[PDB]
Design a protein around this nucleic acid. Sequence first.
RNA 1: GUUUUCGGAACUGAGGCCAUGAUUAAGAGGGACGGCCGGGGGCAUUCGUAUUGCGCCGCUAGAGGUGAAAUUCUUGGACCG
Length: 136
Amino acid sequence: SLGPQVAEGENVFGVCHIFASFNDTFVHVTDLSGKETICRVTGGMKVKADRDESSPYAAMLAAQDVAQRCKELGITALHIKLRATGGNRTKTPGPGAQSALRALARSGMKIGRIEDVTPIPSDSTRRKGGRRGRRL
RNA sequence: GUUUUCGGAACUGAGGCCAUGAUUAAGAGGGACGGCCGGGGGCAUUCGUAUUGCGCCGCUAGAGGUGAAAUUCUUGGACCG
């Protein structure tokens, strides 16, 4: 797992798909094409209590672990690909995206272009729930 | 015992005459004509992302869900790309 390239002149790029719902966050790193992956730790991996799996703490620890693994293998520059749960459920990102991005930037890498790739439907099927909604 | 005067009513030919003869165009209505306007209607095409299932590839022990959990799917590779 070594590479005889230059390090001072330029940097090696990858992309990171940050998928964040209201109950779990994902920090997934692939190559530029996206077929081949590098590392993934989810927000339920760090905390052992499944209540706050979408906490900023678990997203911060997962982003720090992903950045440590990427520095171990040799990825320095990274393109952010932000995604919520999408569909017809909601479009607001979950409560770990900003914390994971700040932890990933503070770890000592380089950030390129931030992109929102949440699936926006053009009038898809019926949303889950009744006509009166979830009354609680 | 003629046929008139002793006269009861329908129709047509030709001319003259009438100041010869049809009130208007509703801030009523119908219709026609000209340029448009509108997720108005019917039929046949065409496009968009999303959902689900399936085929292949790569890292992988968690993923879903809740106020909190569980039923649920998972090294026979779930979730994610």
